[model samples]
Target: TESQIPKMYEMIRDQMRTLASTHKIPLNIDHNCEVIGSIIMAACTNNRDLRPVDKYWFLMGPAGAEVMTEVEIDIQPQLQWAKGAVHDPKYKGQWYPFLALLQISNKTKDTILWQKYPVTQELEISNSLEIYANGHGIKDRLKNSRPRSVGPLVHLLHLKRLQENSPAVNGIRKSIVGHLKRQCIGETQKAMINQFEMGRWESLSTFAASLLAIKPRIENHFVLTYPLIANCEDFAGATLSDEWVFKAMEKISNKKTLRVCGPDEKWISFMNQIYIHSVFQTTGEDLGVLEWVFGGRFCQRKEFGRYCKKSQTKVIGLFTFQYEYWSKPLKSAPRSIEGSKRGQISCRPSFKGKRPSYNNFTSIDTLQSASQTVSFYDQVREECQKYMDLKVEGTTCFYRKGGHVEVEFPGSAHCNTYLFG
Candidate 1:
């Protein structure tokens, strides 16, 4: 299977081409170099040898141009070497060198020289000290920091070759590069160690697989009263609400299956009769000042408001017309139905009048509460059963203080699951 690896590289190239074409973007050699380099690094990290085992090629095009028009073939030697080194680590790991090569390839300018010049020559004669210091030289320092006899000289040589054809950049090519080399590397290593200690990587894949295996169930049903309101701003006035309700009723009546009850029917007729109740309550009595002031002129005043409010005082009088006479109704009735039509259709019989005796309902807020004992037991049992089904060896236990469900593994067999609600 390893011998057939070049096909995979070809596939990646094809995919890149397809993506670029689909997005109507240009496929430059530099961009191809970066993508191909990343793909090679990923494959190598996954223990797949790509150097002598695989071959990769790319075609370059102008900005926003398709690959089919301006295409060229180029070999990916850095990726090849990376794959070889990963496959056989004893050959001196080549990831650092390959990364350096990728950087050189991405450089659009051509003054930098990495392969032909030595570190001393690069620093003293040219302005590429930062690049050299940051890339290959930094890796050398990392290699030398430990007591190991092996060094990163070969990777440095590869880096030199990468920069040989590229232009040299002036000044510190970003001081952050040094910070990344010194501090970020240590942080990355520490994070990897912590992940191992926490058993995160080992358990994550199995949990992901189980999630992938489970299929979500979806059921479709009509809700009688609106559970979710939509576009509330559309219904501004009282008349708007009445209009919407009437439209909804009309739509329901127009449905193909028009289930109805006769007026003479007793039980069915009572159930079918629709009642619109208003819950609004009057907070205060309407004062008789407006009636006494306007008398029979109230209707004429309202109808001819635009003609009457020619001045500011008339406008003020028009605004205060309703304020003096009317008060808002209190306790408006519910505008929607109580239960779903589906629920009514699926109703089951229960004890006639007398209520059955039951324990007082207790609200369970925390896992430590006595009310949550049943939930805790159920969760542990469910997780344990899931682990067993997955052939994962572990012990499930619950902690009351943290409300945590923990899985303990034995020896090399690892398993873990966590639940928080």
Candidate 2:
């Protein structure tokens, strides 16, 4: 099994090489990493000291909503850790109502809903910070903040329909306008969260095992696990170009109305249909916008400190550990695997028999890639110039700080704004 690991890596290297040259796909290290990680996971067994353990996974309800007791798990790590840190003797274990749980008793435990819990700490921190930041108008800002249950489009659709007072809207809402309005005041995000998570569970529960067994040529799992990587550009492009989406979204906060998504189909299916249709377009495929936007920025030490001290230690220690071994001098000559250090520790370093070479200018390499020389924005600008026949007179040609771009037009017709991440 261990011997198969390198072969799997080699297989992916060959496949990616072919795909890059023939299918216009670029080299992606994340896909490679996931393939390696998944193969390593699949190849391991209890005999190899890989054992399954039950862990509690939390699901957070919307703010001010209580989770059903059936969904609550036993042990609470974060609460206990807090008690040890602060030593509050009067702390009676009063917890936030946002806490909910998913148990490991079902068939869905090992694969679907397996790794990271659906909830995030940012939600709680954001609520607390909003309360601290504002005094009088705090309620509106907290009320307006969009939850992570779905994307912007789903939010627009749901909020718009919730404002409409038609009786037919009951099919989408829970029956009465007053009841649904009250429900939005209480549990809007909770229903959306369950809708999204339950849809995910059902889809994976049906096909995941079979797909693994058959080894079909599905999209790379990294992209499949998070479809936004491949679909974000097209989805954002379509949604932004449509004038009605913005107006309808404006109405949910205000009272303007227009015809958009119908109320017959379920919201989750509607979301999937919109996503699938948008992704099927060939306009923005393999352009690497997702990678550019998400991975371009580095966190400063100050920003890192503000997040969490434990996170700071984990990140700093990981980097320290890498550099610790990476810069260490080779102690002894290399040997064959048959008689080398046990577990092949001697073969760990790439520079096995020689001193390690350090590449101290990786930051320079990264900066060079994000510039106008080989940038995604250049390709986008070229496409814009060809299609729209616009002149880039006033806009900065350099893509160092990437975001909004303004294209100048002929006559006094004003400038057209283009957004890139």
Candidate 3:
């Protein structure tokens, strides 16, 4: 059933007032409500086919207001549905006529009623009423559509904060607060704490000591011995004494080289003579004794061999210890010699020079077969000893390999005895 159009307008005005009051703001009631009511009246008058309640209005409002004033309306449900369906997937599926009504109403600016009820038909009645009511044309109404303003919200908040700190605006103080909070905090503190801690001095010292204390196994010993021999060879031009040569030999024999010693007694004898005494003692006295002492303390085995094909060479060697006595220092300047004596003993060689070889040299074919027949350890030992004896001393002197001693002694009888006697 259709209600009277005037009644509908009154009902809408009342509802709008209620909505405005709920938001605690007086709507620009006089002119705004009149403008809204006219658009509704226009939609209803044109929409004869529509029941009273089924219509829509568009409007803008205050930033905080929930209800909008009616700026325009759609009277034809079909036109409205057609327009909405084009924009909305849901409406396109089921309610297309309502979208068409909306499109016609938008196109006509909610004034479709005037043309359908023109002056030639109900001209004076409709035209005079529209004019008296100040109803808007389509172009004028669309021009007034704008996004709702939120400027009032910003203004009000600024005013409330202004009241907190008195009426005057303190630009300098606000700038300072902004700078401190946003720019300066925590910058240097972040930089200082990102470095790694260095290792402790005591921990490093302990590591160094452990490295020095580790004993070299047989292979490691051989490796160390080889380097020592190479260094000695390089420094041979610097005059060495019998003591140096002995020390060098001790250094070599004490290492793991004897692990390669053969079953031949002649090899053992050659090592005892040439390697232990001749090669090692080539370094002069002072350094020689120290090297020898350290060498004997570390070295654990001794054996050697010579090549039967080279009859002039000798090999087999032995390890032995030698000692020297030292007197203790006196406490008083005029005091006689103290009875305490110190013994410094280090390993030394009993013989020197190349070992003698066999009369009948084994042919290469016989030697190859013989090598297969011998124990691996015995064969390796024999080969090593033979290699050592056969090795040329290359620019090295047999007697003073590391050169001669330079004597610098005090005039005292003790010094003379030690240096020259």
Best by lDDT: 3
Error of 1 at 414 (Å): 38
Scored by lDDT, model 3 comes in at 0.26
Lowest summed lDDT window (length 10), candidate 1 = 313-322
* Candidate maximizing TM-score: 1
Candidate 2, lDDT over the whole model: 0.22
Candidate 3: RMSD over Cα atoms? 52.4
Q: Give the alpha carbon lDDT tens digit for every residue of 1-421 in model 2.
A: 1222223223323433432233232222222222222322221211223222222111113332312111222212322332342222332221110000000001111111122222212222222111111111112212122122111222323433355435665464442222222222212223333443333323222122221111111110011111122111122222212222222222221321111121222222222222222222101122222223222221111211122211111101000000000011111111111222212112347554787556423344322323346443333333222222212221122122222243222222211211110
Model 3 over residues 268-299: C-alpha lDDT tens digits?
A: 43323223222232111232332332332211
The digit string of per-residue lDDT tens for model 1 on 5-68 reads 2233233345344434543433333223334434443444433333333333333344333132
Worst 10 residues of 2 by lDDT: 317-326
lDDT scores for all predictions? 0.26, 0.22, 0.26
Q: Candidate 3: where are CA atoms >4 Å away?
A: 1-228, 231-238, 258-263, 276-307, 310-421
Clashing pairs counted in every model: 18, 0, 62
TM-score of each: 0.18, 0.17, 0.14
lDDT of 1: 0.26
